[PDB]
Amino acid sequence: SIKSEFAEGAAVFVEGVAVFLTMMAAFQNGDKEAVAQYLARGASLYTRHEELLNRLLQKLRREGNKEAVTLMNEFTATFQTGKSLANALIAAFKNGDDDSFESYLQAIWKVIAKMATILDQIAKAI
Numbered sequence: 001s002i003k004s005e006f007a008e009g010a011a012v013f014v015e016g017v018a019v020f021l022t023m024m025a026a027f028q029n030g031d032k033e034a035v036a037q038y039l040a041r042g043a044s045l046y047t048r049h050e051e052l053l054n055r056l057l058q059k060l061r062r063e064g065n066k067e068a069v070t071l072m073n074e075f076t077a078t079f080q081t082g083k084s085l086a087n088a089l090i091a092a093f094k095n096g097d098d099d100s101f102e103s104y105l106q107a108i109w110k111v112i113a114k115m116a117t118i119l120d121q122i123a124k125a126i
Contacts, residue, residue: 002059002126009052016045024105067125075118082111
């Protein structure tokens with residue numbers, strides 16, 4: 001259903017945020033191996049999340065839920081362009097570039113806060 005698939009996608013989001021937080025703390029501790037592992041885990045969450053968001057967006061469009069479709073457009077535009085920041089974070093990791101890595105952590109955290117706010121709004125529109 002729209003409600004159950006929304007909730008499952010929210011759960012993947014929550015997992016993504018949990019991995020992100022552990023990757024930030026691993027960075028602060030200098031733990032190259034843990035960062036590498038969490039980067040890899042975050043990327044497999046992208047594939048699953050994208051499948052869930054696309055199907056839900058289809059389903060909302062087809063029900064004609066204008067408010068929810070508008071909000072999901074905001075969420076999915078943010079998700080898709082956010083991939084560029086994630087790729088830049090990976091690039092910085094391969095470059096052993098701590099300054100850039102830290103700065104893209106900050107940027108991705110802001111994207112996550114914006115996504116969390118939109119998700120709260122979508123919950124109330126379905």
